[PDB]
Design a protein around this ligand. Structure first.
Ligand SMILES: CCCCCCCCCCCCCCCCCC(=O)OC[C@H](COP(=O)([O-])OCC(O)COP(=O)([O-])OC[C@@H](COC(=O)CCCCCCCCCCCCCCCCC)OC(=O)CCCCCCCCCCCCCCCCC)OC(=O)CCCCCCCCCCCCCCCCC
Ligand SMILES: CCCCCCCCCCCCCCCCCC(=O)OC[C@H](COP(=O)([O-])OCC(O)COP(=O)([O-])OC[C@@H](COC(=O)CCCCCCCCCCCCCCCCC)OC(=O)CCCCCCCCCCCCCCCCC)OC(=O)CCCCCCCCCCCCCCCCC
Ligand SMILES: CCCCCCCCCCCCCCCCCC(=O)OC[C@H](COP(=O)([O-])OCC(O)COP(=O)([O-])OC[C@@H](COC(=O)CCCCCCCCCCCCCCCCC)OC(=O)CCCCCCCCCCCCCCCCC)OC(=O)CCCCCCCCCCCCCCCCC
Ligand SMILES: CCCCCCCCCCCCCCCCCC(=O)OC[C@H](COP(=O)([O-])OCC[N+](C)(C)C)OC(=O)CCCCCCCCCCCCCCCCC
Lengths: 329, 50, 187, 122, 58, 290, 50
């Protein structure tokens, strides 16, 4: 009670908060009435049962009609950045595996080989979560700034803003790719890697594949808008982004080339076997379809209408199935 | 297996012994409040014997 | 009122310090009454931790040069001489802990604070006492009071720590609903 | 107020949903029955997420367990995620069981209250 | 029995867990807080004193 | 480590420059919005919230708090005894903003009037009564007279329960349960705030310490039925400049030229932009020198 | 959530005027259509039908 419960209480409270409705618990905490009917326990549960969907709708509205919040965006994309942050590294390694040395280090040239190469270093900074902080910073930056500066904008304006911000923040992406593909731990950190790159090659080395990255980003933004809208052409957009994927793989190869971490240089990257230009296509598509970006700020009118209609349909379940049709209300 | 059967038997025994404590929420409208009330149980004697 | 028994006449030092800390954290006692008590507590701690250092040289100069001390040193092993020195130093240190003027001053300051609390909240000062956890001493309670004072008077009094001023809603207890019922359990 | 016997059809998910909604929002039900249903829902909602969280933690540990870690990703992922599936299904099953048992008790109370059982009377 | 009685201090139990209105509660009027009063068990007619003590001698 | 230092300095300078640009744009936009709001307030064209609106405020109805913010609204109703204090500084002086419930509508849902006196359903909104100094917080009286009751209507046919609000403006209603006193207020609808650790806006509910207005928590603690409408927005009462000390009336109602200002301000954004610009310029100068 | 596009009509008077089966009330004839011997009306008075 003096040495265990004080330290164990926070853990149990956090578990209960995760596993229980905070709003409902807060409503039930306050007991009594001040002079208005409807403050009893029975009414509060009835109110909370609808307040669930009401709060969902209010949060969605805030993400649309109010300035985007970094905490809200991170909460929306928690899975893609918190628990499955090593899939980004594994996909990058698979894309760059054509001109890497991993195939000679007990790894096959497939998604399983990329996973094994990533996991050989463990789960921490040298393993699965390597580059997780860099990915989180890049997401809290370029996508977040793009949302801030293109909230409630058309597809063209959103693509332009995202392209500009990606061009501005491109060096961070290159450093993150290098850290992902550094299997032997040559670089001790992002700053060390950037310093080595600048010292050896010119500052232009950090801007390799910028145009293909921007084109692939535009295609991905179009696909995201289509899937948010829910139109049947989302599959055609998925095929389009699949066709544009070689742009992404070329970008990764250019970023990873011209360094001891790769067997090929910038000139040789272009003349690589064309049969490996779709390395990691299916993994990338599956990962992006399962954990797509939930940018409610860029949702168009059709997406907002779809979400509101779904919430209203869910809300329509709070009536008695056997209600009698009465002549007088 | 003995531990599993022991847990099942204990759970059933706890349910049976808790039966006799009749606890129910009563809603007083004057204060608009739910309060716990404890009362005895009336049941056929066969259930008590078993 | 010499013949009047104060409500806390039976309280120990730990209980009195805990009551002072509880009052300060509940904001019954303002920060303007602490500094004298804090200074007295710090002086008492310094004196308690420094007494043996000043005492041992004095014992070496005067007590250990006495006839019986010289007899013990010369006629008995160095181990027994060291044991005698340690025992006498410990006895003197315990006597100081029992009858330090600084300890008396700290107790007097605590008594003044308790009198102020009694004047402010009537007989309800007894409600500020609880079953203190074992091994939590008066020094620990004084340290906690000092820490709370520093937190409230620091730069993070509204950013990382709660502000001293109270913003409790203004309601009427005789009519405002209560969280607990006298006999039954509410939902 | 429904068919009984082995040959009869067990309660369907749609039937259970309709019955619980009726007990919650119908005017012919009594306050005690409605409170029973509400208490069932509130006190059962916890397990659905508790089981999922426990399964997530156990699967995270099992993914790094001594043999799972060294096993290849093809079977390592399945072996590490099996505990999560087991815990999630356990949580959902216990939540549904508690909720449905209390809802069926409420349904029995309503049936006795309105005298809709052919062999129940005072 | 009055010493054994616990409902006398029941009003403090709520504020032992909810400090929000503890100051407002302390600002009330002290009538029988931490005190015992025994009603006159014998008839006394002394205009000099307006109240008489009937506390147990022990 | 010259290359590492140069790279770090360049990254810091770039980030600082982008932050300065963002803060400058935000400052310009906020200044324009504040000027427009000041012009709108000076126009002095308030909207009267009465009838069905009193029960369902238009901003709550249409979820248009963004459009309705900083608009003069005239309301009628009766306050509640409870008061809420939120720490805040006005004119560089420490104090507490005072909020009170204001019942804008009442509904009666009891048909057994002669058997039970069931309590009604009160739809209310929080209204900021003004600002008081910290040392004078105790001077605030529970259920104080905020504004004198509005004069009774001249029309005799208006002495009935309104179909929407349900209020009866009769000074002496023959039915005691139907008796109610109404007062008229004019204020500005304001958006509810949010937690902000950086801005020193942290609330400790258990300890009764509040630095930002939490409409949801206030509604929960005061046990108000219209929780969603309360959380939607709150009104800030505005009174014409009295130009007097008004000794005793410590809670000073807000004025059109002294109403509470939002957390995001042009001055704050300009300060942030200046700091970022100075840091970026210093980094660029250091890079050039190196 | 349930208030989304639920109250599309607010001025009940306009609908009543537009749809009720009664002669237009905007006619200026009613000002002096008839003549009556009434006076001392120092306060507003309303006419109740039937
Ligand atoms: C529950 C089931 C699903 C589980 C998913 C996993 C979940 C895991 C947990 C989540 C977290 C982890 C995330 C995933 C991690 C990675 C997992 C993994 O290992 O998987 C990879 C794994 C492969 O890894 P690998 O071993 O490295 O691959 C072998 C080689 O290394 C390959 O080397 P390569 O990459 O170099 O390959 C070269 C490339 C060759 O390059 C090409 O692409 C060739 C292109 C030729 C030219 C074509 C264009 C011609 C010109 C254009 C003409 C038309 C337009 C004209 C325009 C004119 C005007 C301009 O090959 C291909 O493109 C074909 C590859 C095989 C395709 C298999 C598709 C399976 C379909 C499944 C059934 C249907 C869908 C059902 C969905 C719903 C299920 C309920 O994938 C599989 O084998 C199957 C995985 C499961 C399939 C799921 C289906 C997709 C679901 C999501 C997307 C939505 C549906 C899309 C289809 C329907 C659209 C309508
Ligand atoms: C939760 C409550 C609070 C929430 C707050 C909101 C959350 C979001 C906040 C985001 C913002 C935070 C504030 C900013 C921080 C900035 C820090 C910083 O300085 O880092 C920078 C970073 C630091 O470098 P470094 O430290 O030397 O090396 C980085 C390491 O590799 C490290 O990277 P790594 O990926 O290798 O790391 C491996 C990873 C392995 O471990 C993991 O990944 C485990 C976590 C997995 C995900 C979460 C799972 C669930 C939760 C588990 C929690 C476990 C405990 C975590 C404890 C963390 C520490 C307290 O973690 C580690 O092992 C860390 C190693 C420890 C030393 C370094 C990190 C220090 C601590 C930072 C903690 C920040 C945490 C924030 C998020 C927290 C979320 C809970 O440097 C760069 O990124 C340099 C980029 C240079 C690019 C090239 C530039 C060239 C010039 C171009 C200029 C631009 C263009 C110019 C104009 C041109 C013309 C247009
Ligand atoms: C409510 C919370 C409650 C928490 C309770 C915590 C209780 C701790 C008890 C510690 C004392 C008992 C430990 C017994 C271990 C087993 C003894 C044995 O027979 O093994 C012999 C074994 C050698 O076996 P052998 O057959 O002679 O030779 C095998 C060969 O060498 C070849 O090797 P191998 O391939 O056979 O390797 C076998 C290895 C393979 O198995 C594994 O890979 C183990 C996977 C499960 C790990 C479970 C971790 C503990 C549970 C979770 C803790 C809370 C996490 C919360 C996260 C929140 C995120 C938001 O399995 C083990 O031996 C088991 C332990 C291995 C540990 C590996 C390194 C773990 C790093 C991550 C944790 C520490 C990070 C510190 C970061 C810096 C400070 C902040 O040697 C060991 O590995 C013994 C290690 C003993 C020291 C362990 C220290 C752990 C400290 C944990 C502190 C609490 C967490 C703090 C987190 C702070 C950040 C959030
Ligand atoms: C995660 C993958 C790794 C492999 C895991 C393999 C299983 C590990 C099991 C560890 C031992 C568990 C012993 C539990 C004893 C106490 C049970 C109890 O009291 O019940 C509480 C709880 C049940 O609580 P309950 O009250 O909800 O019970 C529900 C009761 N019924 C089902 C009737 C509705 O136990 C369980 O959840 C399940 C217990 C099953 C016990 C089975 C024992 C006999 C079979 C032994 C099989 C041996 C397999 C060997 C390995 C094979 C590997 C391929």
């Amino acid at each position: 009670a003096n040495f265990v419960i004080p330290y164990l209480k926070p853990v149990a409270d956090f578990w209960n908060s995760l596993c229980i409705d905070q709003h409902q618990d807060s409503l039930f905490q306050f007991k009594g009435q001040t002079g208005s009917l409807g403050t009893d326990w029975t009414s509060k549960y009835l109110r909370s049962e609808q307040d669930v969907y009401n709060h969902k709708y209010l949060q969605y509205h805030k993400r649309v009609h109010e300035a985007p919040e970094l905490t809200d965006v991170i909460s929306d994309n928690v899975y893609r950045l918190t628990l499955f942050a090593g899939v980004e590294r594994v996909l990058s390694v698979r894309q760059a595996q054509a001109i890497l040395k991993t195939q000679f280090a007990g790894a096959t040239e497939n998604i399983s080989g990329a996973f094994q190469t990533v996991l050989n270093g463990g789960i921490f900074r040298r393993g699965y979560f390597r580059g997780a902080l860099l990915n989180l910073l890049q997401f809290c930056g370029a996508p977040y700034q793009s949302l801030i500066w293109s909230r409630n904008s058309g597809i063209t304006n959103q693509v332009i803003v995202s392209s500009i911000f990606e061009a501005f923040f491109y060096p961070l992406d290159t450093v993150k790719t290098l850290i992902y593909n550094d299997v032997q731990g040559k670089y001790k950190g992002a700053f060390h890697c950037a310093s080595q790159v600048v010292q050896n090659a010119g500052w232009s080395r950090l801007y390799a594949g910028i145009f293909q990255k921007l084109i692939f980003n535009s295609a991905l933004i179009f696909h995201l808008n289509q899937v948010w809208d829910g139109s049947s052409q989302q599959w055609a957009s998925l095929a389009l982004v699949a066709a544009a994927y070689p742009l992404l793989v070329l970008k990764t190869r250019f970023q990873v080339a011209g360094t001891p971490l790769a067997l090929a240089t910038s000139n040789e990257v272009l003349k690589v076997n064309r049969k490996t230009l779709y390395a990691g296509l299916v993994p990338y598509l599956i990962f992006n379809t399962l954990f797509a970006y939930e940018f409610a700020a860029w949702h168009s009118s059709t997406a907002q209408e779809r979400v509101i209609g779904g919430l209203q349909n869910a809300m329509k379940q709070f009536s008695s199935p056997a209600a009698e049709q009465v002549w007088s209300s | 297996l003995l531990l599993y059967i022991l847990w099942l038997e204990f759970y059933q025994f706890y349910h049976i012994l808790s039966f006799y404590g009749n606890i129910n929420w009563a809603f007083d409208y004057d204060e608009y409040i739910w309060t716990l009330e404890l009362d005895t149980r009336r049941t056929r004697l066969a259930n008590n014997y078993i | 009122n010499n013949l009047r028994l104060k409500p806390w006449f039976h309280w120990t030092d730990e209980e009195r310090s805990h009551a002072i800390f509880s009052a300060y954290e509940k904001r019954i006692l303002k920060s303007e009454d602490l500094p004298s008590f804090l200074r007295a507590n710090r002086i008492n701690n310094v004196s308690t931790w420094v007494f043996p250092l000043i005492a041992l040289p004095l014992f070496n100069q005067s007590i250990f040069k006495l006839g019986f001390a010289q007899r013990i040193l010369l006629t008995r092993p160095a181990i027994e001489w060291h044991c005698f020195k340690i025992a006498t130093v410990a006895a003197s240190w315990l006597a100081w802990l029992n009858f330090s003027p600084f300890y008396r001053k700290l107790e007097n300051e605590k008594e003044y604070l308790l009198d102020t609390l009694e004047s402010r909240i009537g007989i309800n000062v007894l409600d500020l006492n609880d079953a203190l956890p074992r091994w939590t001493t008066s020094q620990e309670y004084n340290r906690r009071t000092q820490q709370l004072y520093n937190q409230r008077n620091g730069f993070f009094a509204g950013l990382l720590y709660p502000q001293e001023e109270s913003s409790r809603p203004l309601v009427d207890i005789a009519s405002f609903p209560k969280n607990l019922h006298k006999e039954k359990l509410t939902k | 107020m429904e068919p009984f016997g082995t040959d009869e059809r067990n309660w369907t998910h749609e039937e259970k949903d309709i019955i619980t909604r009726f007990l919650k929002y119908d005017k012919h039900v009594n306050l005690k029955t409605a409170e029973m249903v509400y208490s069932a829902e509130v006190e059962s909602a916890y397990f659905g997420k508790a089981g999922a969280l426990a399964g997530g933690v156990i699967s995270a540990l099992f993914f790094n367990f001594p043999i799972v870690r060294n096993l290849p990703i093809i079977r390592r992922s399945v072996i590490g995620v099996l505990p999560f599936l087991y815990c999630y299904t356990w949580g959902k099953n216990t939540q549904e069981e508690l909720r449905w048992l209390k809802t069926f008790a409420a349904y029995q109370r309503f049936v006795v209250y309105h005298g809709q059982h052919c062999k129940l009377w005072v | 029995f009055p010493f054994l009685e616990k409902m006398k201090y029941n009003q403090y139990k709520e504020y032992k867990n909810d400090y929000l209105f503890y100051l407002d509660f302390l600002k009330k009027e002290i009538t029988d807080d931490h005190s015992f009063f025994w009603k006159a068990r014998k008839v006394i007619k002394l205009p000099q004193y307006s109240v008489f003590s009937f506390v147990p001698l022990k | 480590s010259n290359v590492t230092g140069k790279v770090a300095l360049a990254t810091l300078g770039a980030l600082t420059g982008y932050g300065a640009f963002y803060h400058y744009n935000q400052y310009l936009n906020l200044s324009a919005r504040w000027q427009q709001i000041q012009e709108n307030i000076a126009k002095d064209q308030p909207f009267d919230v009465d009838g069905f609106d009193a029960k369902v405020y238009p901003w709550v109805r249409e979820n248009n708090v963004n459009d309705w913010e900083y608009k003069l609204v005239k309301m009628r109703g009766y306050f509640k005894d409870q008061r809420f204090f939120v720490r805040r500084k006005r004119d560089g002086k420490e104090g507490f903003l005072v909020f009170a419930p204001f019942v804008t509508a009442v509904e009666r849902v009891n048909h057994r009037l002669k058997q039970k006196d069931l309590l009604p359903v009160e739809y209310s909104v929080f209204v900021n009564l003004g600002w008081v100094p910290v040392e004078n917080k105790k001077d605030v009286e529970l259920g104080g007279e905020v504004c004198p009751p509005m004069d009774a209507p001249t029309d005799s046919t208006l002495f009935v329960n309104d179909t929407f609000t349900g209020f009866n403006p009769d000074p002496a209603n023959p039915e005691d349960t139907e008796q109610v006193t109404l007062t008229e207020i004019t204020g500005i609808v304001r958006r509810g705030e949010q937690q902000d650790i950086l801005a020193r806006r942290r609330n400790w509910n258990k300890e009764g310490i509040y630095n930002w207005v939490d409409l949801d928590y206030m509604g929960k603690i005061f046990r108000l039925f219209n929780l969603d409408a309360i959380n939607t927005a709150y009104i800030e009462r505005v009174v014409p400049s009295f130009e007097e000390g008004e000794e005793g009336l410590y809670p000073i109602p807000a004025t059109k030229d002294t109403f509470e200002r939002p957390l995001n301000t042009p001055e704050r954004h300009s300060t942030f932009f200046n700091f970022y610009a100075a840091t970026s310029a210093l980094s660029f100068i250091s890079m050039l020198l190196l | 959530l349930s208030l989304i596009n639920q109250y599309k009509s607010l001025n009940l008077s306009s609908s009543i005027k537009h749809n009720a089966p009664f002669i237009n009330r905007d006619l200026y004839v009613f000002d002096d259509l008839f003549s009556y011997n009434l006076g001392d009306i120092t306060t507003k008075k309303s006419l109740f039908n039937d």
